[PDB]
Amino acid sequence: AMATRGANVIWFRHGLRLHDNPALLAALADKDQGIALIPVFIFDGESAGTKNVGYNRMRFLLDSLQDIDDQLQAATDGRGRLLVFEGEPAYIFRRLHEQVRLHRICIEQDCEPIWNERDESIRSLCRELNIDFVEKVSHTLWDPQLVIETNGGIPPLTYQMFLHTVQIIGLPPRPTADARLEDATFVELDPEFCRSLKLFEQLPTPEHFNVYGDNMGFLAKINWRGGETQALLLLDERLKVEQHAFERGFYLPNQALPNIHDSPKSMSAHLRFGCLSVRRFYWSVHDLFKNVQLGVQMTGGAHITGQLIWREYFYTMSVNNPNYDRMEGNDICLSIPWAKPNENLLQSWRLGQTGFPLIDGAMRQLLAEGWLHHTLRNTVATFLTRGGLWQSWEHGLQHFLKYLLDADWSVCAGNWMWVSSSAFERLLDSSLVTCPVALAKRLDPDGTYIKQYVPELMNVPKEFVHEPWRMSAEQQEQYECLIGVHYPERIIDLSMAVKRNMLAMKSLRNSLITPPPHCRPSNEEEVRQFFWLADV
Amino acid sequence: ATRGANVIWFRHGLRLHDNPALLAALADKDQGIALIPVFIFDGESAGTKNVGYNRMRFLLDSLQDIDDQLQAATDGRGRLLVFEGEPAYIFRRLHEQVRLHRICIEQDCEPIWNERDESIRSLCRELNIDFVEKVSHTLWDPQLVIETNGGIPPLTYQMFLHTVQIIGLPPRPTADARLEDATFVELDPEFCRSLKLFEQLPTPEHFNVYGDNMGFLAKINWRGGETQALLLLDERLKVEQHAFERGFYLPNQALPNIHDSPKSMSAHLRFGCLSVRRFYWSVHDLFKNVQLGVQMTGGAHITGQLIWREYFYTMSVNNPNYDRMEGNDICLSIPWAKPNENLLQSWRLGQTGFPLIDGAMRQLLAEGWLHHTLRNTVATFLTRGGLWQSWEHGLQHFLKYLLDADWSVCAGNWMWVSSSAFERLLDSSLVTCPVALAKRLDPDGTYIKQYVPELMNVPKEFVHEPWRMSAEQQEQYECLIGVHYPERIIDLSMAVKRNMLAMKSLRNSLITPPPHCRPSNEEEVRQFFWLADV
Ligand SMILES: Cc1cc2nc3c(=O)[nH]c(=O)nc-3n(C[C@H](O)[C@H](O)[C@H](O)COP(=O)(O)OP(=O)(O)OC[C@H]3O[C@@H](n4cnc5c(N)ncnc54)[C@H](O)[C@@H]3O)c2cc1C
Ligand SMILES: Cc1cc2nc3c(=O)[nH]c(=O)nc-3n(C[C@H](O)[C@H](O)[C@H](O)COP(=O)(O)OP(=O)(O)OC[C@H]3O[C@@H](n4cnc5c(N)ncnc54)[C@H](O)[C@@H]3O)c2cc1C
Ligand SMILES: [N+]
Ligand SMILES: [N+]
Ligand code: NA
Numbered sequence A: 001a002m003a004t005r006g007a008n009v010i011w012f013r014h015g016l017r018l019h020d021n022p023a024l025l026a027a028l029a030d031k032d033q034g035i036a037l038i039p040v041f042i043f044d045g046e047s048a049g050t051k052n053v054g055y056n057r058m059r060f061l062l063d064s065l066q067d068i069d070d071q072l073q074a075a076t077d078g079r080g081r082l083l084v085f086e087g088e089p090a091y092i093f094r095r096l097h098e099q100v101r102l103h104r105i106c107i108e109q110d111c112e113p114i115w116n117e118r119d120e121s122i123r124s125l126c127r128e129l130n131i132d133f134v135e136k137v138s139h140t141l142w143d144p145q146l147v148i149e150t151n152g153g154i155p156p157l158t159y160q161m162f163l164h165t166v167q168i169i170g171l172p173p174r175p176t177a178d179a180r181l182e183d184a185t186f187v188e189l190d191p192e193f194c195r196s197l198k199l200f201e202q203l204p205t206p207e208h209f210n211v212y213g214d215n216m217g218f219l220a221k222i223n224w225r226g227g228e229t230q231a232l233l234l235l236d237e238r239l240k241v242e243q244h245a246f247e248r249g250f251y252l253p254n255q256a257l258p259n260i261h262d263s264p265k266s267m268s269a270h271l272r273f274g275c276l277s278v279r280r281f282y283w284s285v286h287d288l289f290k291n292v293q294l295g296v297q298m299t300g301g302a303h304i305t306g307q308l309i310w311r312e313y314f315y316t317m318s319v320n321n322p323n324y325d326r327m328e329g330n331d332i333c334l335s336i337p338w339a340k341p342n343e344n345l346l347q348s349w350r351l352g353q354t355g356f357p358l359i360d361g362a363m364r365q366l367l368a369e370g371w372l373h374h375t376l377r378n379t380v381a382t383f384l385t386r387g388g389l390w391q392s393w394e395h396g397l398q399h400f401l402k403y404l405l406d407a408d409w410s411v412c413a414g415n416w417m418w419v420s421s422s423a424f425e426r427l428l429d430s431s432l433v434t435c436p437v438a439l440a441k442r443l444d445p446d447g448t449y450i451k452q453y454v455p456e457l458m459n460v461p462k463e464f465v466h467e468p469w470r471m472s473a474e475q476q477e478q479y480e481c482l483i484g485v486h487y488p489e490r491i492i493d494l495s496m497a498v499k500r501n502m503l504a505m506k507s508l509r510n511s512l513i514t515p516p517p518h519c520r521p522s523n524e525e526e527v528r529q530f531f532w533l534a535d536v
Numbered sequence B: 001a002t003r004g005a006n007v008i009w010f011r012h013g014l015r016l017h018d019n020p021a022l023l024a025a026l027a028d029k030d031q032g033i034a035l036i037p038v039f040i041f042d043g044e045s046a047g048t049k050n051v052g053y054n055r056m057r058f059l060l061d062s063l064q065d066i067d068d069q070l071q072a073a074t075d076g077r078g079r080l081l082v083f084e085g086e087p088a089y090i091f092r093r094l095h096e097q098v099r100l101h102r103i104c105i106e107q108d109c110e111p112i113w114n115e116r117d118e119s120i121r122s123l124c125r126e127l128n129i130d131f132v133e134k135v136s137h138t139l140w141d142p143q144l145v146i147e148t149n150g151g152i153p154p155l156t157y158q159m160f161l162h163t164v165q166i167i168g169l170p171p172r173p174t175a176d177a178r179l180e181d182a183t184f185v186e187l188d189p190e191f192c193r194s195l196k197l198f199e200q201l202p203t204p205e206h207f208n209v210y211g212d213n214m215g216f217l218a219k220i221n222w223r224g225g226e227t228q229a230l231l232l233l234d235e236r237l238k239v240e241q242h243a244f245e246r247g248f249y250l251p252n253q254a255l256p257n258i259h260d261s262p263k264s265m266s267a268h269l270r271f272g273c274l275s276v277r278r279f280y281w282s283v284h285d286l287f288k289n290v291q292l293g294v295q296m297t298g299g300a301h302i303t304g305q306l307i308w309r310e311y312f313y314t315m316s317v318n319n320p321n322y323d324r325m326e327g328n329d330i331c332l333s334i335p336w337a338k339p340n341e342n343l344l345q346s347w348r349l350g351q352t353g354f355p356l357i358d359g360a361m362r363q364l365l366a367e368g369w370l371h372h373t374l375r376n377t378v379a380t381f382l383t384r385g386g387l388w389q390s391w392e393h394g395l396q397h398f399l400k401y402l403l404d405a406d407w408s409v410c411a412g413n414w415m416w417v418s419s420s421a422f423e424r425l426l427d428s429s430l431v432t433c434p435v436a437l438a439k440r441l442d443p444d445g446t447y448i449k450q451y452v453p454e455l456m457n458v459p460k461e462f463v464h465e466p467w468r469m470s471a472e473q474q475e476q477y478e479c480l481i482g483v484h485y486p487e488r489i490i491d492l493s494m495a496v497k498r499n500m501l502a503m504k505s506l507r508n509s510l511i512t513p514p515p516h517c518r519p520s521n522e523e524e525v526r527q528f529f530w531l532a533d534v
Helices: A022-028 A055-075 A089-099 A113-129 A144-150 A159-169 A191-196 A228-247 A268-273 A278-292 A302-318 A343-351 A357-369 A374-384 A393-403 A409-420 A436-443 A448-453 A473-478 A494-512 A524-530 B020-026 B053-072 B087-097 B111-127 B142-148 B157-167 B189-194 B226-245 B266-271 B276-290 B300-316 B341-349 B355-367 B372-382 B391-401 B407-418 B434-441 B446-451 B471-476 B492-509 B522-528
Strands: A007-012 A036-043 A083-086 A102-108 A132-136 B005-010 B034-041 B081-084 B100-106 B130-134
Touching: A007 A022, A007 A089, A022 A102, A022 A132, A036 A055, A036 A089, A055 A228, A055 A268, A089 A102, A089 A113, A089 A191, A102 A113, A113 A132, A144 A159, A144 A302, A159 A302, A228 A268, A228 A278, A278 A302, A302 A409, A343 A357, A343 A374, A357 A374, A357 A393, A357 A436, A357 A448, A374 A393, A374 A409, A374 A436, A393 A409, B005 B020, B005 B087, B020 B100, B020 B130, B034 B053, B034 B087, B053 B226, B053 B266, B087 B100, B087 B111, B100 B111, B111 B130, B142 B157, B142 B300, B157 B300, B226 B266, B226 B276, B276 B300, B300 B407, B341 B355, B341 B372, B355 B372, B355 B391, B355 B434, B355 B446, B372 B391, B372 B407, B372 B434, B391 B407
Parallel strands: A007 A036, A007 A102, A036 A083, A102 A132, B005 B034, B005 B100, B034 B081, B100 B130
Antiparallel strands: none
């Protein structure tokens, strides 16, 4: 009877939330005619970033599915559930269509080109089966196609060009209303069909996908809880923080040092899985201040609002570029003659065995927890590339894409290229941006951060903790820390590396004479904010 | 002959643009009511009581500007009439010659102008003259702001913003005045003589003001008047545009430039050569159509600067004692040292032996304008950060030699800077150190060698701390301390200890801080002083 009436699918990939979910609303729009809802997620070997993934992000993802499932049950008195499958989407959806007739398959759009093949196969399937393929934009602030269209059919390569494009377009859509689940119908599937199509009964663990709690030697430290429920708690906290900050005259972040000793309050992973709607984030910041805004005069939330648009910028840049995550064949990235892969240096970098305390601390925190402050992401990225080992950013990106809790394909690639390959931004070759030691004394004066993530430095006194090599032979003995034994010797000479790298970047500028269009800082001031530079 | 005429009486508001009083005066043109443009040197109007050569010249420049514009727009028919004498007496005598239907003025909100204005109000009642007053010297009607804040002025800049956020945007500038078809009066030549109507604009010397500023030849770098004001606004708008395009918003991003071109409109704003509403709205309209929600846009800081001016003007409105410590409820009573006339005079003359202080005080005498950071420096040095003398001596000297010198803005800043005992950041010799400050503000001593000529030959390594030259170096560079350049008049190290202690005692004797004019928070201090995040 109900199986004859039919159903709509809301297919989660990203967009892992019930709030501001226009695809979900569309799936629910046929309630009146008794048409059921089938909420589903499919472990694909790909979807939601599961191809190149580590334990920390796997756990975060599983947390977010568990959250959706929980909310589903709670609001339907147990009738509704998240159906989690493992297998190929086209195969799964064709079989499900047989069991109960699918009126619509509804998705939140995934604008990155690495999702095009997956989605075309479902679009193609929907044609053959006469299913309505409903695709709604809500992972990004605006319809990236609209932005690209308004910018002459190509993507803005510069943050400021990006703002100039959306200023023409106007404010982004507000979040949609909440979904009404109380009166939804859900399907009972045949238990033998469920066995056959690999419908999980309990949500799988990371180990089931052959992903274990060991990140290159480090015991995974789980400081975040994935999911829409947490995402909304974190939003509240951040809105309060913004309010206090404004009240106390703090506008731009340059008015306070980056704080790397901070609690795990970041919503970056939540934004990447859509546990938090970026439109809800944008608009609740806007509504919090706009009332108290007086003309063109500074109001609250200005910077945080711009942060969201940085996300928008990189996502949008990627849309029509399958080569976004590499240098060769990528026409928005400069061709820079990086050194040949040196696996020894690459592993040392990956492991936090470089011999520069701050780099090592950042990399080890990365492996353990899967999240770094923007400023530490700059520092290890700069060190790996232009300001250091002169290794291609592509090695850095593949490492980040695995061990970060966020690791948005487009955003991670974008920041990597922006930082490493903007040859014509000469500030970026300066040592105030390069020097990991001076930056350590600024970010971590007392060695608190360094001693935490580089525990062999624990007894080295504050005087030497940033520069353990300056200890004498005797001192290294006294503090149980021998350079080349207990803690690695610096794997490269930074001063000569910087001299060599500048020359090479200047030589590259000379051969182009004129800068081709590439992903780059809008201007020098933008670089200064972006690296949180100390006036100087 | 009972035709009638309206007076537009300039005191401040020295401009034809955005002049609702002028517009009101012109509004009867169709009934053939003439216009009589009037300025009166009455001993005090437009800050002419305690005035030096430089500002008198700026003022005369602005009067000349109005007169030239009046002539150019009427083929010589319209003239600015400038009298010397007492306003009530002058308007009474004028009214006998030609019936006055209205006397129109831009409001002067400072209490120091209440006696003058009430005397004309009273005269208008008696003579059946309509006394018309318009708000256009300030952004909002200061009375409204005060009513909105519980009947008392906001003592804090943030409290002030909070108060105007409730009221909404300030009025836009008015349309331009249409003078071409206007009528003017020809008075009786004898009446003109007996009433001391000038034929040519007076010079400062007519008022016993001479081009010598405490031994300093007056250097006129500024041109008074609306015409010049409108040009400077255009230049400034282009600056804001380029500043926004290159990413600069808060300007903790750029060092203060103390040796910049004479581009400030501070004096023009004080005299009303430039409408503050035109400034506000020109900035706003430049960026609002490219602002997206709550995101940063252009002109944020400059707009705020206009608000600081509003903040201080408003605060003074109902406080005749704004310019002094005793009897002044919004100023903490601080036990300043009794006057030391030698030290005060050394401060005025730039004979303190600290190059930056001396440089700034001499620039002040010669040119009558200083960068905000230099005003801060010489102000904390006189009081609190140095000599421990009352800000009152600082104010009276500023009110004389500055090109701007708004009674309320000047007093308000002097108090904010000198007497905010509870902002401990202001205690730190690190924001009171003129040597460290000079090395940051003027690394090559370019500014110092200009206004302190005797240091001209001192190498860069020594120009900020000349006393560090050996006997031989002092001789070689023609700068003997105590001889060519005075010895430091005070030991700052010991002074800072002494001063911090006194301020601490003050804070400790008041268990709870009374309401007083003060910074809103530490971050505000940081921007106000242009501090290096250190
Ligand atoms: C080498 C490198 C790789 C990076 N990879 C990622 C990534 O995979 N995913 C990711 O979200 N960010 C990435 N970033 C940018 C940035 O460091 C993180 O977004 C930031 O650290 C998140 O912390 P937060 O939530 O407290 O940021 P906030 O300053 O509080 O900003 C809030 C949100 O705005 C967005 N945002 C902030 N900065 C950027 C930025 N530079 N580019 C794009 N969006 C931004 C993020 O969604 C962030 O969560 C990378 C930066 C570098 C240098
Ligand atoms: C002891 C002391 C006395 C002062 N006396 C005066 C004075 O008599 N008249 C005066 O206009 N300013 C005064 N100021 C404030 C300030 O230094 C000047 O307004 C500024 O130097 C003018 O330069 P600018 O036009 O380039 O400023 P901008 O930064 O370009 O600001 C533009 C306008 O905003 C207003 N503004 C800026 N800062 C302030 C401020 N702190 N308080 C009130 N308004 C401000 C002024 O009208 C100024 O012209 C004083 C400051 C101190 C510390
Ligand atoms: N969204
Ligand atoms: N003169
Ligand atoms: Na993110």
